[PDB]
Each structure stands twice: as C-alpha cells, then as structure tokens.
C-alpha cells in the first residue's frame, strides 16, 4: 500500500533523511488516500491508469529515455474526453496536495542554531536572520545602539501590493479545504497520537482530499474582476489578518530581548497591504470606472466586517468594572441614549448595563460596523444607501479613538497588563488594515492620457497634443496647471476609450482617498507623462490626488528616465505637489522582455543608483516599487538575501515590492510561512537601511557593462530580429491558446513568461546569459574566475544567478523537444534545436560560475521539492501537447480506448485549461 | 522564585514522579504568577501577608499542630475589612486554578495498558473500560453477538439533568478566562517549544490570571433565576455542543472495530440533557410561572442560535454542485421565490446561485434558524411577536428534513465520505439538542398540590379534599379525571401559593411540549399525590401531559413507595395514561438526612429492587431518576463504578441522573474530561443491563438489615432528638447565615449538607456509620471479615464506603474544633467534642474495613488533588470562623493592622460570601 508509493517516491530524491524530513512520507500518504479516492469515485480502472501515467513519468524523470515519454504520450492520446478531463483533473489535485505536503514541510523544518555569519545565510528560510537575530547584528556588528535600532523600526514601512494570480484565481471556499487538508495531514504526526484519534484523523484527511477534489465546476464564464478580486482577497481571512498582530508581538519580545522596555507603538504603520485588482487596466478594457468602484467597496465591506466579526470576542473578555472617568463618563452617555429592545446580534442582543463599561464602548463601535458594511452592500447591489454619515465609520481615526480610550481606562486602573492582550491585538489591525485592508493602485498607460489630452486640445481649437514635442507639452501642462478656467466642457467629445479614462478620474475624485494608493503610469518615457495625470486629477478637482509614479519599462526608457526625473524635480509646481516624496516603479518582467534579463537587471541596478542620487540631490525622499519578475518576488528565504541585495540607499526605511499571484499560496497560505513573510521583509528592510550590501568593483561593472551588450545582442537577434520567432513561438508554445481564454513587442510581459514556463523551456528567464558568459571567457581566461567571485561576493550577482538556476531546475529541454515534433512544421525543427543547444550550453556555463556539478546543490530542500512535482508536472505537460495537436489539427486522430472512469459536453478546451492551470501551479514563479 | 514554590508544594504531597505526573509543577506555575501579579496590583506587603498565609496553612496541614492554626487566626482576625476582602479573593482565584491545573493532570494522566478486569478498575479514570473495551467485554466475557450490543445501544438512552450550582454559578465570561489559562499552562508544556513562543505564552498565561483576578465586582443582588439558568447553560457552548458529536463518533469507531460496518444512526437519541433551573419551585417561590417561561423561551432562543452561529462554516463547506433530483427541485423552488437584495449576514449576503444547490438549501435553513431565534428573543423582551410559525421551526423534524435531504443527495451523487463530516455532526447535534437543548423538568411539592384541590373541593361546596382519607382521594381524583365538565370556574378564590401553582399549568399548556420533560412531585407519599398532578394537568386541558414522578423522601415514604406504585399501576386510567412507562425518583441525601446516610443508601437500594420487580409484574417499563447525593453523582471514574453498581435490571437501557452543579466544572469544563464523562455514562448504561452484578449474600443483607437500625438510631438520636443539637448546629456552622441571602426535618437537604462541609466537619455524610460497624463488630468479630468481603467483592458496598472514604479525605476536625472554640458557648463544647470523638472512631472502622491504614490509600492521585488544595481552603476556614465571630458579635474587637494593600463600602458580609465561594469550590460534592 502505503510503503511500495513511499519506495517510488524516494527513488525519485535520494537525499540524507533526518527526523524532521517527511516531505516524501507527507506525498506518499497523501497519494496513497488520493489513489483510493479516485479508485471509489471513477473505478479502479481509472485508478491504474492514472498510476500508470504516475509510473512512466517517475520513470522518464529518473534517467530521461525520450522511450518513456513517447509511452505515456501513447496512453494519454489514446483517452477520450471524459477520460482525459479526470485524469487532467487528478494530476492537478496532487499538484495541490504536493505543495501543501511542502508548505507543512518548510514549516517544520528544523532552525540552523550556529548560522556561519556570510550574507548567503540569508538565501534560506532554515538559515536566515529573524528580527531578534537582526537587532542583534546591528547592535553588536554595526554599532547601532538599541535606541537607534528601534527608531528605525518606527519609522519605516513595508508596503506589500498583491497581484493577480495570472491563471487561476483560487476560490475560498477549496482554500479552506486545502488548509484542513495540511492540518489534518500535520496532527498525523502529533507525538503521543491515539490510537483511535489516529483512525479519525485518517478518515478526515480522506474526506478533505475528496472534498477538495470534488470542488471542480467548470464554469463557461471567465471569473468577473469583482470575482478574482474578492478570491483575492481570502488570505486575509485564512492568515493575514491574525498573523500582522502575531509579528508584531514577537517584535515586541525582541525588542525587550535587547533592553528596549516598550512595546512597538501600536499605530507605527510599519506594514501596509495594498492591491491591483480591480485598479490595473493597462491594456485590459474589462477594468472599467464600475469595476473600480465595486473593488473599492468591497474593500471596505470585507475590512468592516472582519472587525465586526471578531468584537463580539473583544466584548466578552472585556468584562471588567474598574474604569477610568473619561470612559465612565463616555459609557453613561452611550448608556443614556440607548435603545430599549432587540439587536439582531449573536452575542449581546439585550441592552448593554452600565456596570459593563467596556462592553457598552465597544457595543457601539460594533453598531457602527456593522452600519459601515451594510452601507457598502446597499451601494455596491442597490447603487446607494439611505445610511447617513455619523451611522458609519468615514475615516479611521473615528474607530481607533474608543479602543484608545478602552486602552488608557485599563493602563490607568492597574491593568496594562491586559490591555496589551487581544485589545492591543485589534489597536494593531485597525492601525494596519485601516477601513479599507488594501489601498488599490490605479494603472494605465501613458498613451491613453495622450490620448484624452489630445481629444481636450483639439476640441479647444489649440491644436494637437500628440502632434506636440516634448518641450511645448511641458510648457502647455505647466500653464494649464495653475489655469484659471477648466479644460473640459460637456461637448467635449468622447471615444469609448476616452470616456473609460476620464470616468476612472471621476471615480477617484468621488470615492474616500484612504480607498487609493499610487497611479502608476505604465510604459512611461517622460516628464510630460507624469505632469499628464497631474493635470488630469486636478481637472477633476481630487481633493487627495494620488501620487503620480512613472513605470520605465524599455531599456531605452530606462536610461531616459534619469533626465525625465531630474526636470520633474527641477519644477516648482511638481516639487510642491510631491512634498518632499516620490515613488518610481520598474519592472523587471517588462525590461527583460524588451532586451533578455541579464542585462534588465544590471540596468536595473544602475537606473536605481541613479535616480537614488537624483533624489538625493533635489531632496526628495525615494521609493523604488519593486514590480513583478526580480529577485525580490521569490518568496521564502531568497527574498530575504534578494532584499538585502539592493543597491546602497534604494530602501531607506520604505519597501514597496509586488506579491506575484503566483507566490501568495506560498507565502502567506500556511500560518507559520505567513509569519515567516512578514518577518523577512520587515527584518531586510531594517537592516538594508544600516548594512548595505558591498558597491561593486570597477572591473566588475565594466565586465558586467560588456556583457550585456552582447546579452542583449543575443536576446534581441533571436526574439525581434529572426523572422520566423514569432512563427516558431505560435507553434511550439500554448500562447495563441492563452491569449483567446505587433509582435513580441506588443505582447505583454505575464503571456511571454507564462507560455514558455508551460513547455518547461524558459526562454525568457536565460536567453542572453549564455552570450554573455561565453563572450566574457573566450575573451579572457581570467574572467571565468572574476565571475565566480561575483557569484562568491557579490550579493546582486549572486541572487542574479541563483533565480536563473532555479528556473533550470524546474525546466526539462524533452518536453519542448516533444513539443517541436508534435507542434512544430519540419522546417523550423533546427530552430528549436539550436535553442535546445543554447539552453544547454547556457545552463553549462552557469553552473560553472556558480561551482556546481549540478542544479541547485546550494539548495537540496528546494531541489527536493522541484524534483517531487515534476512527474505530476510532466503528465500534464504531454495532456496538454496531444491536446493542442487535437485542438489545432481536426482531422488528427488516434484510436480510442473505451471509456475507463465510471460516475455513481465538455470538450478539449476544457481539457486544455485543466492543464494550463495544473502546470503553472506546479511550476510557481519563474521570472 | 519557581523552584523553592515547588519546593514548598512538593513537601505537601509525597508520590513517585514519572514524566506524566505534572500537578505540582502546574501549581507552583500558576501560584507564582499570581503572587506577581498581586504584588503589582496590591503592593509588596499584600503579596507577603498572602504568602505568610499560605505557609502557615501549609506547615498547619504538614504537622497538624494547633498552634499553626492560632497564628493563622491571629493573622487573618488583625486584617481590615479592605484587606480581609483581598485575601479572601486570592485565596479562592488560587483554588479555581489549582481546580483548572488538576482539570489538565486528569486529561493527559496516561491510561493503564493492561487493566486487571477487577470491577474496581472501573472506579478510576486511568483503568476503566472506554467504550470499545466495554463493546469486547460483552462480545468476548458476556457472549454477546456485535450485532446485540448495536442493537441495544441503538435503543439506549442517557439523560443527564443539570442542576444549579448551590453557591456560585460561574458566569460565562469568567469560564472562558479559565478555559484559556489551562491552555496557555498545556501550551507551556508543548513538546519543542520555541524560547520565544515560550516567553509569549508565559506572558499570556500572567495575563489571563490577572484577568481572571480582575472579573471580581461584588453585584448587590442575588442572581435572578434567569441569569441563573443562562451561566448554568454556559458549558454547553465550551464543551457539551462539540463534545456530543465528537464520543458519537468515537462510537462509529469502536462500532467498526467490532465488526459493525455502520455509524451509529444519526438521530438515535443516545444522550439528551435536561435541566431543573428555572423548573424546580420546590422551597422556592422565586421560582414562578413567569420565570419558567422565560427559561424555556431563553433555551430555545441559545438553541437555536447556536445551530445560526455554525450554519455559515457548513454552506461554505458545502460549496458541491452535484446534487440528486429532489434536491436540485427543491434548490430551484427556492432560487425563484428568492429575495433580490442584502442579508445583514456575515457570509452569504448576496442572493445565492442555483449552481450552489447545497448553500440553496443551507441559506434557507439559516433564515429559519434566525427568525426562531428573533421570535424567542421578542417573547422575552416585548411580551409577543409578529414572527409567524412557518417563518420559523415549530418542530425538530422541519430542521432534520433538510439536512437529511442535503445527506441523501450526498449519498446519491457518490459523496457519501463527504456527508459523514460535518453534515454528520450538524445531525446529530440537532437530533441531541432539538430546538430546546434541554428538556426543562418542573417540580413542586405534594402539599402544594393538595391544597390547590383543597381550594377546588370547598368552593365547589364538596368538603375538604385536605380532610379526606386516602381512600376518599383516590375515588374521587378518578371519577373526576372522566368527568365531563371543568372543576376550575372564574371565581375560585385563590391565595398567592395557589395561583402560583395554577398558573404554572398554564404555562405548561400554553408552551410547546418540547420544551418539558417530567414533573416531579417532592415529598411524595402516595398515589393521590400522583393522580393530584394528574388531574390538574387534565383540567388544564395540556396536549401532551408531562410524565408524573414522585419522589419518595423519607425513609417511611421509600417503605410506602412500593403499595402506592402497585395501586398506580392497577388502575386502569393510570396505566392508560402511562403507556407502558413510568419513572421515579430518589432523592439520597433527602433520604439521608431523614435517617442517615449508611440507612437510607441500603433502604434505596432495597426499595429499587423492589418496585423493578413490581414494574415487571404489572408490564411497565420503570427508570429511576437519581437525585442528587450518590455515588452516581461523583463525576470522574467513581461515576463508572457507582453506575455498574446499580441493582439489576434498574437501568435496563435508560438512565437518568442528575449532573450537580457543583460537578458541573469537573465533568464538562476541559473538553477531555467532557469526553470521558459521555463515555463513561453511555459505557456503563449499556453494560450494566447485559451484566448486573453479584447480588448480595443472605448474611449480607441481613448484616445490613440489622446495621440500618442501629445507624439510624445513632443518626436520629444526634440529630433529633438531642433537645440541643439545633442550637449547637447554628453555632459551630454558617447555617443561618447561608439562608438569609420546625428543625433540621424542614431544612433542605442542600443547606444541611453545605453547612457541615463548609466546617470540613461534614457530619451529614458519616454520622451512623460508626455504631453501624462498631455493633456489628463486637456482636460478632466474624462480621469485620464479612465486611472485608464485602467491601471486596460487592459493588454497592465498595462504592458506598469509598464515597464516605473521600469526604473524609476532604474533612478536618482541627477546623471544626477551633469553630466550637470560637463559635460556641463554652456549655456545648463536650457535645462538639464527642461528635469529633465519632468522627475519629467512625473514620478508624471505615480505614479497617477498607483495609487502609490511610485515607484513599486506594485512589493515590485524588489524595494528591485533595491534599495540594488543603492550604487554601483551611485559610478560607480560618478567615470565615473570624467573620463569623465579628457578625455575630458587635463586641468582638482586636487591634487592627495599618491598612496593607494598595491600589492603583464592602463589609463582612462580603468577605463572608467570598470564603463561602471559595470553601466550596474547593470542597466540590460530597453528601
């Protein structure tokens, strides 16, 4: 049973096992309750099949005979739709369990006690520093006092913006199976675990596994943004939420650990959750001026009522008698005016005596939270409500003021002591998560602003915006900056993307501006882009405009933005609107699409150095937003030494950093990793700020300098100048299949990294390292030595290389080999070859520099986890291969088995989404 | 700081330490924190005059020397009233912990592998059979098929009938503050426990404590009989409402491992609870119609609402979209009569999709459970309600329906796993609790009821019921129980008493029959007592008439109980009436202070025996109520005992006991122990009537025949006909004082036992014991061997010396003897003292008999709980014996100490009420 699937598995990852290392024992305990799952639902035909997918994938991933592949790709073209679907299903679902089994894992793993000190520490979740460690290497390394430690603290903030997942929002309801799943499977491993406690657990386990698997609905609509934004949003509920008070306390106790005898003020705002759904419609029509409105609605509907949700808790402990005057006198108001008769409460349904003060404070902030939700729904289903003002909460300050006097009454009657419990808990939410949890970034392009500029200009009689150099648009937007008069008159007339974009405004201008973040500008190049949106949210009257933040994404755009930066700071108007502050983001994905990563990420190092010193140099205050695709969005231990790499002074107490939708399972899904995440953002941030990584040397930047031209040259001559790339890309990716569910140019960067992550191929994570490592060595001997003492030394580099070779190791160059001869006309084959060629010879130098023999021997317990998914993984990968082939191809058939599953018209596309959801699951994040 | 508290402690308890053994530890934990936390709340002094208190008591329980006794006293008789109050407090906070402490030995003390089969193994929680062991005993020892034993369980029921905690009902904010210091302390304990997750919890557990401390004001008034009734509900919500789900699961687990391969069905009603707060008016004219009302109306508003507040985390669940035909209907129906717009929910606030059919199902079951709810909770606030019947359940089968619906079309669809979660347990919860989680029982005494048909008789002209015979009664209670018009016209003249009873039908008549179950006559005699109520009920035309139980009290009474059943049961209107069942009840400690405690247990004992046999005879199915005050209202192991104990056949698959509310807390407050309680009770119900045990030797009934006479002559002749024990009990005892907030014959049973037990006397429990064994002896030296034999090998016998056993474990005559000291006039302290003299010679025959030369040498971890709070509670004894003297003398005066606590008009009465508390929370049950 159990023993012959733990056998399987561990062939598959030879390796040195402790008692704390079950992850291979977690996969076959879970597969095994699985296989007998899908034995009763489907039959045991079923069953074998899909162990029999199982067994030649664990076969081909154990020494790569092309043979086995070919077999299962047999087997699986042989199934019929029916079929097909359950067995696409199936292996996703142990995808699912795979990375929970993973997550429980890293958890438990035990804790290095004696870290060696060298900043690759801080690479591993097992290794790195947690706050008190850090507290200590800045008191005892870098001379900080304490003092010094804990202002610091104070003043800095981490700010974390989620992102869509881009394939596969999961609905809250399976996240609440998956996460009984991961308990269940850990309380199995309970030391001292009953008999019979044990046979209950294992039925329960069987029952989640079944629960999870049976929640499958394939629904014809794509989910609403509404939808994707409220699923979204369920890791608040399931860990967030609990887990910022829980971080928070522990950096209390480290504090008190170093001599600091005071807790973290409650309202120091040192992490704040922001979000882009809803708020990106950069080249996405379904993101209107509606949606925006709903998404900020729901926001402030689900913070309202996740306090309310949990003060009836507060009320009961808060029992106590002894209070102070103010609030004796504040309760005998509220006691006064209060109603003789029923609420329609679970908790305190009678009225309120005045012998319970607390209770009679926090009763009434629970009436207006539960005002300020029903409000927002009346909005959002009926488009108003009759609820008044002084009925709700409209700004924060408004809801902390009675918890702060509940926490004074208790300090001044002798109870400090119980104030700092669930009181301080809930002072630390509100102070975190305000009235609405995230605050949501507006984004679109700066040609959409163009655009509507354009359409005022001409209806005005003046004149042509975009026909306007660069110079006069300057001029034209200072001067209607201070105008006397408005812009836009009621003929203005309106296309329907001009309409869409000026509505967005209105919206802005009519929603509470604690709802808003930044308005990002993408594919911005220039001053006049930034003063465009100024000019647009002044026209509209925003009483609290949003900071304007360009998003230089092309290299060529890159190295403008130094200039555009420096004139908007050399501007009166703007320097007084910006107050000392301003936020730029980059995007990793965006560069390096434009001109292949390895030379994105040096120009990203050096943009940043850059526009550091511009600030500087003007006074203004600098946030780098961190965008999708670097270093920084790994997750787990990598960010952390991901973090402390940045270049001297690009954090300087402010964090701004995207969690990709592909990450957030991982780092906030499980409660101890949700924790872990807090922590290590906060801890690098701090440190970052006193203990800069070391500047790199002259020789360094000038090979750097050199190979990336050659980098690029590469990339480009491969991606934008070979005139069969497009034509080679459509057929050997799923990206045609993707994009209906200008080139490569004009697709966007999440499509590009998506469609060659599914063929496990990865061109756009490695594509130009190999030109550039080559060149350097043939050009020098030497430099091969240089390279591996930048990878030894130098922080940059060495995460650099770290998430390419992590993407290496999740890629496998057989299954885009099947895909070229399934997929691909005969004469583009040697163009897929060569690539192959290159990807080898790339991964072959890489390791080199890195001085490994093979892929990932820094990181066993990563590679463990890689090697564990990718069966699963690679049966996908061949569903999905026929499946193109059957969807592109209708007069390619094969014989058919007779239908395998039993029960007790869905079709290839369905089938095709199944894998395309499974193989990105399993594969996480790339680049 | 830790280690000498230990130190200290441990010195008090001698015992042989393994790993499990952890009691010490977890008091000295707990007792220093709190010392800390009175320091910083009441200052240095405070803490030290605590502790000075506490050594002393401990040195006092050490060597027993008087002299420790008189510094104690000194000590606590120079304290203010301020400071008297504080150390009153502290002392009884210190007992309720060191309670939650033993609360948590009890749970993880390690079973007993191999059990030596002894009955006596079913005495200790350790050793005794779970129910699996008791499912092999009766298949493998008794023969029994598997399919026997489910069958009998099947049609097995228990019913636990709570009680009001004599003194202190524990309010449900202050429960939940307990509950969560003996979490924090087992978390303190957690194997691999982080330093820092450590220093947490320690600070939690130093908060929980104070909190707890801090929950302390001092309310004017008694507790009204509904608030009473709402804290007594309170372990429902803590431990009962997931317990009942969690054993009926272990019971489909021992089923399956049997051989039985079903659950036990759903709705078999295994346990049901009822409840005597707000129900039983015996003695208690607090307790009127409007009251009884109110605690039906209160128990169907909590039932309901706790179905409410657990319906929204089985919709999300139950996020399935397959569904069978008569589901998926009946989801259609209600998805076209579905309201457009906002639920004020916390969950599913929007309309729900068809494609949900489950949460279809589910939400409309959500909207009935809350209007139920809103109903009751307008009936009490506003007198009535708009809220029509079929917006709201009127019957458990219309909330079973749709759940079983919802279970079905699990089934069908293949998800049958799935069904046997929580659905499983949600079922069974409704079918244990119903829409009134407990059955309310009314009592009343039979006097009460004579006099209304006294009333009756004499306005109607007829005579005086009161004056007729016995006879007379009969004849004409019969022919007006067919008589064709109503007794009862619109100008009978009524006193108070009687329309108090009156009324109190009416309210039977006018509530659903759901809510009641029997009506209990107290101080029963005869047959017309019973058709008296028979009657009424009748005359008040109630639909479903309560079951009539008397209960027979005296020992005359229990003699006369057997002719009056036979003539119930001969009687054709009666037996009609009945349907083949009857119950009645015993009341123990009744019995025993009518004759003593050794007399009345041998007189139940023969009086059940007897009136089974009668019951047999005439076709009537027989349960007999225990009442408080033996062996079977123990709780903890003994509880398992007493119940195989039983006479033969007096269970026969129904159980009814009373559940004291000062067992409550042991029995049901740590989920565990709430565990094990269900067990035990469902356990020995079942086995008891496939193996009743030994019945008793000729020579040992008439052994105990002839030791009854002499007992009660020794109990009666103390206590009734000693012209000054009266006046000697109102002196060494808080009696009167204890009933102001015809002799000892109409003192309740409750006040006579609380009094002595309060003075660690505890009188009502052993006296006549000791002229029982010392005549039987020295009649014949033979009979202490025959005694010995007995206590080995009988089960009744056992039990009943081992209950006596433990109270004097709990007693200390040194208190009783610094009371007369104090207390009583210098001319009764012989007779104070020769009672000591029987106490000591009555505990010495006891010890010989039992074949200890120590108290429970027998039951070492109950000496242990007992001895680790002997400290406390004697500080308590010392300072109430002071309060007394101060109350009862406005001369008695010492000096004073200057003033020692601080902070930052409570009298002795106060501090009175606070040492009562205490002592008995300490003492728990005894007679």
Request: aromatic share 8%; proline share 5%.
């Amino acid at each position: 049973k159990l023993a012959s699937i733990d056998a399987q598995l561990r062939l598959l990852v030879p390796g040195k096992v402790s008692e704390d290392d079950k992850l291979v024992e977690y996969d076959a305990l879970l597969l095994d309750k699985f296989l007998d799952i899908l034995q009763d639902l489907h039959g045991e035909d079923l069953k074998e099949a899909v162990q029999q997918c199982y067994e030649l994938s664990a076969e081909y991933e154990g020494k790569h005979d092309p043979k086995k592949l070919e077999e299962l790709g047999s087997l699986l073209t042989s199934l019929d739709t029916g079929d097909s679907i359950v067995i696409a299903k199936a292996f996703s679902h142990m995808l699912n369990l795979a990375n929970l089994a993973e997550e429980l894992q890293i958890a438990y793993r035990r804790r290095i006690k004696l870290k060696s000190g060298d900043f690759a520490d801080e690479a591993n979740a097992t290794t790195e520093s947690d706050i008190e460690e850090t507290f200590k290497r800045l008191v005892h390394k870098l001379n900080k006092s304490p003092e010094e430690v804990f202002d610091a603290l104070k003043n800095q903030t981490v700010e974390l913006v989620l992102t869509a997942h881009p394939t596969q929002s999961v609905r809250r309801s399976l996240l609440q199976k998956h996460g009984r799943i991961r308990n269940c499977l850990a309380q199995l491993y309970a030391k001292d675990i009953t008999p019979d406690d044990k046979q209950e657990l294992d039925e329960a386990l069987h029952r989640e596994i079944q629960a999870a698997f049976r929640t499958d609905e394939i629904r014809r609509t794509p989910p609403t943004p509404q939808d994707e934004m409220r699923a979204g949003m369920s890791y608040f509920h399931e860990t967030i939420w609990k887990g910022v008070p829980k971080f928070l306390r522990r950096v209390d106790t480290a504090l008190k650990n170093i001599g600091i005898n005071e807790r973290f003020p409650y309202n120091a705002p040192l992490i704040q959750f922001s979000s882009w759904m809803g708020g990106d419609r950069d080249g996405n029509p379904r993101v209107t001026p509606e949606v925006t409105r709903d998404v900020c609605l729901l926001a402030r509907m689900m913070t309202s009522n996740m306090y309310f949700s949990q003060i009836e808790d507060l009320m009961i402990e808060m029992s106590m008698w002894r209070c102070n005057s103010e609030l004796r006198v504040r309760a005998e108001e509220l006691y006064r005016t209060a109603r003789k008769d029923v609420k329609h409460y679970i908790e305190f349904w009678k009225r309120i005596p005045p012998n319970q003060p607390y209770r009679v404070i926090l009763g009434d902030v629970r009436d207006k939270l539960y005002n300020t939700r029903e409000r927002s729904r009346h909005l959002l289903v009926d488009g108003k409500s009759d609820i008044p003002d002084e009925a709700v909460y409209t700004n924060v300050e408004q809801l902390l003021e009675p918890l702060e006097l509940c926490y004074r009454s208790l300090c001044d009657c002798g109870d400090h002591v119980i104030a700092d419990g669930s009181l301080l808990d809930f002072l630390r939410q509100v102070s975190t998560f305000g009235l609405s949890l995230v605050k949501l970034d507006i984004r679109q392009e700066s040609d959409r602003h163009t655009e509507v500029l354009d359409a005022i200009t001409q209806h005005l009689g003046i004149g042509s915006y975009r026909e306007w150099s660069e110079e006069k648009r300057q001029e034209w937007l200072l001067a209607e900056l201070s105008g006397k008069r408005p812009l836009i008159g009621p003929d203005l007339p309106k296309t329907e993307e001009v309409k869409d974009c000026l509505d967005t405004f209105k919206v802005l201008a009519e929603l509470p501006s604690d709802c808003f973040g930044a308005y990002i500008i993408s594919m911005a190049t220039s001053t006049s882009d930034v003063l465009a949106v100024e000019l647009l949210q002044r026209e509209y009257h925003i009483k609290h405009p949003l900071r304007v933040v360009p998003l230089f994404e092309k290299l060529a755009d890159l190295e403008a933005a130094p200039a555009a930066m420096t004139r908007l700071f050399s501007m009166d108007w703007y320097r007084n609107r910006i107050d000392g502050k301003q936020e730029v983001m980059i995007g990793y994905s965006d560069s390096g699409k434009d001109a292949g990563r390895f030379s994105a990420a040096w120009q990203l190092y050096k943009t940043q150095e850059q526009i550091v010193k511009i600030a500087k140099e003007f006074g203004v205050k600098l946030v780098i937003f961190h965008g999708r695709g670097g270093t920084v969005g790994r997750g787990g231990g990598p960010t952390h030494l991901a973090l402390l790499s940045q270049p001297p002074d690009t954090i300087n107490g402010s964090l701004r950093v995207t969690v990709q939708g592909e990450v957030i399972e991982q780092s906030f899904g499980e409660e101890h990793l949700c924790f872990r995440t807090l922590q290590r953002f906060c801890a690098a941030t701090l440190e970052h700020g006193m203990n800069p990584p070391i500047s790199p040397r002259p020789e360094w930047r000038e090979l750097m300098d050199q190979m990336a031209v050659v980098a690029t040259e590469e990339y480009r001559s491969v991606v934008f100048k070979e005139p069969r790339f497009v034509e080679y890309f459509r057929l050997a990716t799923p990206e045609l299949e993707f994009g209906r569910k200008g080139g490569i140019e004009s697709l966007r960067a999440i499509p590009w990294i998506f469609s060659w992550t599914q063929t496990r191929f990865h061109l756009p994570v490695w594509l130009g390292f190999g030109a550039a490592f080559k060149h350097a060595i043939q050009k020098d001997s030497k430099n091969l030595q240089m390279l591996q003492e930048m990878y030894k030394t130098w922080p940059f580099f060495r995460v650099t290389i770290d998430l390419v070779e992590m993407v290496f190791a999740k890629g496998n160059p057989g299954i885009a080999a099947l895909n070229d001869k399934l997929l691909v006309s005969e004469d583009l084959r040697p163009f897929g070859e060569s690539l192959r060629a290159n990807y080898e010879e790339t991964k072959n130098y890489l390791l080199k520099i890195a001085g490994h023999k093979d892929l990932l021997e820094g990181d066993p317990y990563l590679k463990q986890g890689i090697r564990l998914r990718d069966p699963y993984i690679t049966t996908l990968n061949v569903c999905q291969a026929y499946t193109l082939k059957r969807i592109r191809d209708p007069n390619y058939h094969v014989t058919l088995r007779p239908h395998i599953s039993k029960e007790y018209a869905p079709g290839l596309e369905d089938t095709l989404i199944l894998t395309m959801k499974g193989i990105a699951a399993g594969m996480q994040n790339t680049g």
